[PDB]
UniProtKB/Swiss-Prot annotation, chain A:
It is found in: Nucleus. This is Mediator of RNA polymerase II transcription subunit 7. Present with 7598 molecules/cell in log phase SD medium. The chain holds residues 168 to 214 of 222 of the full protein. It comes from the Eukaryota. Component of the Mediator complex, which is composed of at least 21 subunits that form three structurally distinct submodules. The Mediator head module contains MED6, MED8, MED11, SRB4/MED17, SRB5/MED18, ROX3/MED19, SRB2/MED20 and SRB6/MED22, the middle module contains MED1, MED4, NUT1/MED5, MED7, CSE2/MED9, NUT2/MED10, SRB7/MED21 and SOH1/MED31, and the tail module contains MED2, PGD1/MED3, RGR1/MED14, GAL11/MED15 and SIN4/MED16. The head and the middle modules interact directly with RNA polymerase II, whereas the elongated tail module interacts with gene-specific regulatory proteins. Component of the Mediator complex, a coactivator involved in the regulated transcription of nearly all RNA polymerase II-dependent genes. Mediator functions as a bridge to convey information from gene-specific regulatory proteins to the basal RNA polymerase II transcription machinery. The Mediator complex, having a compact conformation in its free form, is recruited to promoters by direct interactions with regulatory proteins and serves for the assembly of a functional preinitiation complex with RNA polymerase II and the general transcription factors.
Swiss-Prot record, chain B:
Component of the Mediator complex, which is composed of at least 21 subunits that form three structurally distinct submodules. The Mediator head module contains MED6, MED8, MED11, SRB4/MED17, SRB5/MED18, ROX3/MED19, SRB2/MED20 and SRB6/MED22, the middle module contains MED1, MED4, NUT1/MED5, MED7, CSE2/MED9, NUT2/MED10, SRB7/MED21 and SOH1/MED31, and the tail module contains MED2, PGD1/MED3, RGR1/MED14, GAL11/MED15 and SIN4/MED16. The head and the middle modules interact directly with RNA polymerase II, whereas the elongated tail module interacts with gene-specific regulatory proteins. It is found in: Nucleus. A motif (Nuclear localization signal) lies at residues 36-49. Present with 1364 molecules/cell in log phase SD medium. This is Mediator of RNA polymerase II transcription subunit 9. Coiled coil: none annotated. Belongs to the Mediator complex subunit 9 family. It comes from Saccharomyces cerevisiae (strain ATCC 204508 / S288c) (Baker's yeast). Component of the Mediator complex, a coactivator involved in the regulated transcription of nearly all RNA polymerase II-dependent genes. Mediator functions as a bridge to convey information from gene-specific regulatory proteins to the basal RNA polymerase II transcription machinery. The Mediator complex, having a compact conformation in its free form, is recruited to promoters by direct interactions with regulatory proteins and serves for the assembly of a functional preinitiation complex with RNA polymerase II and the general transcription factors. The chain holds residues 101 to 149 of 149 of the full protein.
From Swiss-Prot, chain C:
The gene is SRB7. Component of the Mediator complex, a coactivator involved in the regulated transcription of nearly all RNA polymerase II-dependent genes. Mediator functions as a bridge to convey information from gene-specific regulatory proteins to the basal RNA polymerase II transcription machinery. The Mediator complex, having a compact conformation in its free form, is recruited to promoters by direct interactions with regulatory proteins and serves for the assembly of a functional preinitiation complex with RNA polymerase II and the general transcription factors. It comes from Saccharomyces cerevisiae (strain ATCC 204508 / S288c) (Baker's yeast). One of its GO terms (molecular function) is transcription coregulator activity. Keywords: Activator, Coiled coil, Nucleus, Transcription, Transcription regulation. Its main location: nucleus. One of its GO terms (cellular component) is core mediator complex. This is Mediator of RNA polymerase II transcription subunit 21. It is found in: Nucleus. Residues 15-55 form a coiled coil.
Length: 47, 49, 70
């Protein structure tokens, strides 16, 4: 009935770790895209 | 007059007349501006996707 | 009292293990779809990064042949 339930506590720990990894990956590439758009606006203003 | 001429660099470099070097400055100015505008337009078009 | 507050706090202590078993199964399912979604996410992120590399190369070539044009 506890020994197999260890695989469950492991389940949520790797699940939350991969969610954290995923979310910081869309965060970092969204902030890069935002920087690129800001640069594009800056260079368009200098035209 | 010869002393003032001899000791000052600007008054000897700019001895009144314009050779075609001003027109060459205008050619490098205009060619380098328009290529910058073209590449910036290309970047604006590409990045909007 | 710590004994009492720990034995009633085992997570799912009052939950039958078979619904533990459907929830686990659907967890691996939705996991399969979430790494799938990450595989499209990373492939289109690489696609935009390659588009960014191509425009960088084109702009660099433009700079190079412009500043060597005169």
């Amino acid at each position: 009935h506890q020994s197999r339930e260890s695989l469950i506590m492991l389940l949520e720990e790797q699940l939350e770790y991969k969610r954290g990894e995923i979310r910081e990956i869309e965060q970092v590439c969204k902030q890069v895209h935002d920087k690129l758009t800001s640069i594009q606006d800056t260079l368009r203003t200098g035209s | 007059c010869k002393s003032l001429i001899s000791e000052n660099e600007d008054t000897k470099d700019l001895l009144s007349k314009s050779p075609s070097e001003w027109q060459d400055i205008i050619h490098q100015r205009e060619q380098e501006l328009q290529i910058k505008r073209d590449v910036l337009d290309d970047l604006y078009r590409k990045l909007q996707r | 009292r710590q004994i009492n507050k720990l034995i009633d706090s085992l997570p799912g202590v009052d939950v039958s293990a078979e619904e533990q078993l459907r929830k686990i199964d659907m967890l691996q399912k939705k996991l399969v779809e979430v790494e799938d979604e990450k595989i499209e996410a990373i492939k289109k992120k690489e696609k935009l990064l390659r588009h960014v590399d191509s425009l960088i190369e084109d702009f660099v070539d433009g700079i190079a042949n412009s500043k060597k044009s005169t």
